[PDB]
Structure formats: C-alpha cells, structure tokens
PDB file of C-alpha atoms and ligand atoms in Angstrom:
ATOM      1  CA  UNK H   9      33.398 -72.876  83.858  1.00 14.98           C
ATOM      2  CA  UNK H  10      31.163 -70.678  81.723  1.00 15.48           C
ATOM      3  CA  UNK H  11      27.561 -70.087  82.741  1.00 15.56           C
ATOM      4  CA  UNK H  12      24.375 -68.590  81.369  1.00 11.44           C
ATOM      5  CA  UNK H  13      22.288 -66.645  83.930  1.00  8.66           C
ATOM      6  CA  UNK H  14      18.566 -67.163  83.802  1.00  8.20           C
ATOM      7  CA  UNK H  15      16.389 -64.103  83.029  1.00  9.78           C
ATOM      8  CA  UNK H  16      16.042 -62.840  86.608  1.00  9.14           C
ATOM      9  CA  UNK H  17      19.733 -63.077  87.492  1.00  6.85           C
ATOM     10  CA  UNK H  18      20.705 -61.519  84.164  1.00  4.13           C
ATOM     11  CA  UNK H  19      18.448 -58.540  84.831  1.00  4.70           C
ATOM     12  CA  UNK H  20      20.184 -58.141  88.174  1.00  4.08           C
ATOM     13  CA  UNK H  21      23.664 -58.306  86.626  1.00  7.66           C
ATOM     14  CA  UNK H  22      22.934 -55.905  83.790  1.00  8.04           C
ATOM     15  CA  UNK H  23      21.411 -53.386  86.193  1.00  5.77           C
ATOM     16  CA  UNK H  24      24.920 -52.791  87.597  1.00  2.00           C
ATOM     17  CA  UNK H  25      26.737 -52.741  84.253  1.00  2.00           C
ATOM     18  CA  UNK H  26      26.919 -56.365  83.077  1.00  2.00           C
ATOM     19  CA  UNK H  27      26.740 -56.634  79.294  1.00  2.00           C
ATOM     20  CA  UNK H  28      27.113 -60.253  78.169  1.00  2.00           C
ATOM     21  CA  UNK H  29      24.812 -63.249  78.309  1.00  2.35           C
ATOM     22  CA  UNK H  30      27.664 -65.637  79.208  1.00  4.24           C
ATOM     23  CA  UNK H  31      29.985 -65.320  82.237  1.00  6.86           C
ATOM     24  CA  UNK H  32      32.586 -67.062  84.371  1.00  6.42           C
ATOM     25  CA  UNK H  33      31.553 -67.605  88.000  1.00  9.56           C
ATOM     26  CA  UNK H  34      34.046 -64.952  89.158  1.00 10.32           C
ATOM     27  CA  UNK H  35      32.254 -62.384  87.000  1.00 10.65           C
ATOM     28  CA  UNK H  36      28.796 -63.362  88.233  1.00  7.97           C
ATOM     29  CA  UNK H  37      29.981 -62.912  91.806  1.00  6.05           C
ATOM     30  CA  UNK H  38      31.728 -59.665  90.953  1.00  6.22           C
ATOM     31  CA  UNK H  39      28.558 -58.048  89.614  1.00  2.55           C
ATOM     32  CA  UNK H  40      26.331 -59.689  92.210  1.00  2.00           C
ATOM     33  CA  UNK H  41      28.534 -58.181  94.913  1.00  2.00           C
ATOM     34  CA  UNK H  42      28.483 -54.788  93.178  1.00  2.00           C
ATOM     35  CA  UNK H  43      24.725 -55.060  93.188  1.00  2.00           C
ATOM     36  CA  UNK H  44      24.702 -55.778  96.938  1.00  2.00           C
ATOM     37  CA  UNK H  45      27.139 -52.971  97.771  1.00  2.00           C
ATOM     38  CA  UNK H  46      25.437 -50.510  95.436  1.00  2.00           C
ATOM     39  CA  UNK H  47      22.018 -51.050  96.990  1.00  2.00           C
ATOM     40  CA  UNK H  48      23.659 -51.476 100.400  1.00  2.00           C
ATOM     41  CA  UNK H  49      21.584 -54.514 101.317  1.00  2.00           C
ATOM     42  CA  UNK H  50      24.217 -55.387 103.911  1.00  2.00           C
ATOM     43  CA  UNK H  51      23.865 -54.507 107.595  1.00  2.00           C
ATOM     44  CA  UNK H  52      26.047 -51.592 108.787  1.00  2.00           C
ATOM     45  CA  UNK H  53      26.695 -53.200 112.184  1.00  2.00           C
ATOM     46  CA  UNK H  54      27.154 -56.776 110.963  1.00  2.00           C
ATOM     47  CA  UNK H  55      28.599 -56.234 107.439  1.00  2.00           C
ATOM     48  CA  UNK H  56      28.640 -59.868 106.322  1.00  2.00           C
ATOM     49  CA  UNK H  57      24.859 -60.139 106.692  1.00  2.00           C
ATOM     50  CA  UNK H  58      22.703 -59.291 103.667  1.00  2.00           C
ATOM     51  CA  UNK H  59      19.013 -58.271 103.801  1.00  2.00           C
ATOM     52  CA  UNK H  60      17.168 -58.823 100.505  1.00  2.00           C
ATOM     53  CA  UNK H  61      13.566 -59.180 101.551  1.00  2.00           C
ATOM     54  CA  UNK H  62      11.154 -57.810  98.926  1.00  2.00           C
ATOM     55  CA  UNK H  63      14.088 -57.230  96.571  1.00  2.00           C
ATOM     56  CA  UNK H  64      14.996 -58.906  93.258  1.00  2.00           C
ATOM     57  CA  UNK H  65      17.836 -60.717  95.006  1.00  2.00           C
ATOM     58  CA  UNK H  66      15.397 -62.161  97.539  1.00  2.00           C
ATOM     59  CA  UNK H  67      13.227 -63.363  94.684  1.00  2.00           C
ATOM     60  CA  UNK H  68      16.289 -64.937  93.001  1.00  2.00           C
ATOM     61  CA  UNK H  69      17.731 -66.715  96.051  1.00  2.00           C
ATOM     62  CA  UNK H  70      14.437 -67.550  97.735  1.00  2.00           C
ATOM     63  CA  UNK H  71      15.580 -66.243 101.141  1.00  2.00           C
ATOM     64  CA  UNK H  72      15.025 -62.984 103.098  1.00  2.00           C
ATOM     65  CA  UNK H  73      18.644 -62.816 104.279  1.00  2.00           C
ATOM     66  CA  UNK H  74      21.955 -64.626 104.114  1.00  2.00           C
ATOM     67  CA  UNK H  75      25.600 -64.411 105.102  1.00  2.00           C
ATOM     68  CA  UNK H  76      28.363 -63.840 102.579  1.00  2.00           C
ATOM     69  CA  UNK H  77      30.444 -66.146 104.832  1.00  2.00           C
ATOM     70  CA  UNK H  78      28.540 -69.265 103.729  1.00  2.00           C
ATOM     71  CA  UNK H  79      30.090 -69.809 100.365  1.00  2.00           C
ATOM     72  CA  UNK H  80      28.482 -73.200  99.851  1.00  2.00           C
ATOM     73  CA  UNK H  81      24.972 -71.836 100.372  1.00  2.00           C
ATOM     74  CA  UNK H  82      25.630 -68.843  98.133  1.00  2.00           C
ATOM     75  CA  UNK H  83      26.986 -71.106  95.389  1.00  2.00           C
ATOM     76  CA  UNK H  84      23.885 -73.266  95.733  1.00  2.00           C
ATOM     77  CA  UNK H  85      21.478 -70.335  95.422  1.00  2.00           C
ATOM     78  CA  UNK H  86      23.341 -68.864  92.443  1.00  2.00           C
ATOM     79  CA  UNK H  87      23.493 -72.166  90.559  1.00  2.00           C
ATOM     80  CA  UNK H  88      19.701 -72.400  90.648  1.00  2.00           C
ATOM     81  CA  UNK H  89      19.633 -69.210  88.591  1.00  2.00           C
ATOM     82  CA  UNK H  90      21.911 -70.224  85.722  1.00  2.00           C
ATOM     83  CA  UNK H  91      22.660 -73.040  83.353  1.00  2.00           C
ATOM     84  CA  UNK H  92      26.241 -74.291  83.054  1.00  2.00           C
ATOM     85  CA  UNK H  93      27.591 -74.146  79.501  1.00  2.00           C
TER      86      UNK H  93
HETATM   87  C1  1MN Q   1      33.452 -62.089  95.800  1.00  2.00           C
HETATM   88  N1  1MN Q   1      32.827 -60.764  95.877  1.00  2.00           N
HETATM   89  C2  1MN Q   1      32.880 -59.856  94.876  1.00  2.00           C
HETATM   90  O1  1MN Q   1      33.441 -60.137  93.824  1.00  2.00           O
HETATM   91  C3  1MN Q   1      32.196 -58.418  95.013  1.00  2.00           C
HETATM   92  C4  1MN Q   1      33.289 -57.313  94.849  1.00  2.00           C
HETATM   93  C5  1MN Q   1      32.759 -55.903  94.633  1.00  2.00           C
HETATM   94  C6  1MN Q   1      32.433 -54.980  95.666  1.00  2.00           C
HETATM   95  C7  1MN Q   1      31.959 -53.687  95.333  1.00  2.00           C
HETATM   96  C8  1MN Q   1      31.810 -53.313  93.991  1.00  2.00           C
HETATM   97  C9  1MN Q   1      32.130 -54.220  92.981  1.00  2.00           C
HETATM   98  C10 1MN Q   1      32.595 -55.492  93.295  1.00  2.00           C
HETATM   99  O2  1MN Q   1      31.454 -58.339  96.223  1.00  2.00           O
HETATM  100  C11 1MN Q   1      32.067 -58.958  97.342  1.00  2.00           C
HETATM  101  C12 1MN Q   1      31.166 -58.636  98.514  1.00  2.00           C
HETATM  102  C13 1MN Q   1      29.866 -58.120  98.288  1.00  2.00           C
HETATM  103  C14 1MN Q   1      29.003 -57.812  99.333  1.00  2.00           C
HETATM  104  C15 1MN Q   1      29.472 -58.039 100.628  1.00  2.00           C
HETATM  105 BR1  1MN Q   1      28.322 -57.830 102.055  1.00  2.00          BR
HETATM  106  C16 1MN Q   1      30.742 -58.528 100.905  1.00  2.00           C
HETATM  107  C17 1MN Q   1      31.612 -58.841  99.832  1.00  2.00           C
HETATM  108  C18 1MN Q   1      32.101 -60.443  97.038  1.00  2.00           C
HETATM  109  C19 1MN Q   1      30.773 -61.213  97.050  1.00  2.00           C
HETATM  110  C20 1MN Q   1      29.967 -61.216  95.896  1.00  2.00           C
HETATM  111  C21 1MN Q   1      28.733 -61.895  95.958  1.00  2.00           C
HETATM  112  C22 1MN Q   1      28.328 -62.536  97.129  1.00  2.00           C
HETATM  113 BR2  1MN Q   1      26.592 -63.239  97.176  1.00  2.00          BR
HETATM  114  C23 1MN Q   1      29.118 -62.564  98.268  1.00  2.00           C
HETATM  115  C24 1MN Q   1      30.312 -61.902  98.193  1.00  2.00           C
END
C-alpha cells in the first residue's frame, strides 16, 4: 500500500533523512522509529513507552504518550496523517 504523508508527518520523516513524498507503510514506520530513537523520546526504564509531549510527534498523534506495543493505536494515529494512494 503506498501512502502520502500530510505536511506535518512529512516534515518529521524528512528531518531524519526521508527524501520522497510517497512511501510504503514499512518505510513510514522505519523513519518514524528512527525519529523516536534519535530524539530518545522513549523512557530509559520502560523502553516501550514514548513521551512526545510538546514535540512534533505529539502534535501529529494528538497524545502526550503512547506505547509501541499497541500496534492498532499506532496505525490509527499514523493513518490520520497521510492519504492512501
Ligand atoms: C517498526 N519500527 C521501526 O521500523 C524503527 C526501526 C529503527 C530504529 C532505530 C533507527 C532506525 C530505525 O523503530 C522501531 C522502534 C522505534 C522506537 C521504539 Br521505543 C521501539 C521500536 C519500530 C517502530 C517504529 C515506529 C513506531 Br510509532 C513504533 C515502533
């Protein structure tokens, strides 16, 4: 499935090296995760928990924190920031 990230998500992706305007979901996640690990928004003690309050990611998703273990919720939040081609 190819997707087109909306302006805010695209900015996020490109800030960690993304270069296209169109991506597969696996690529969106790849860069999104690189973004998270690069900024280290995860919690050192509980590494599956992500803190993104007052960050671009928080703006994007609409939440102050989330768990990378809830794939359905992450997929939901991501989909709101892209149009499926
Ligand atoms: C599937 N996946 C990835 O592709 C990347 C891999 C990656 C890591 C470092 C540098 C480049 C790419 O991130 C994974 C990830 C990210 C953050 C945490 Br916390 C756990 C796992 C993980 C992931 C990406 C996005 C979300 Br939201 C949740 C998990």
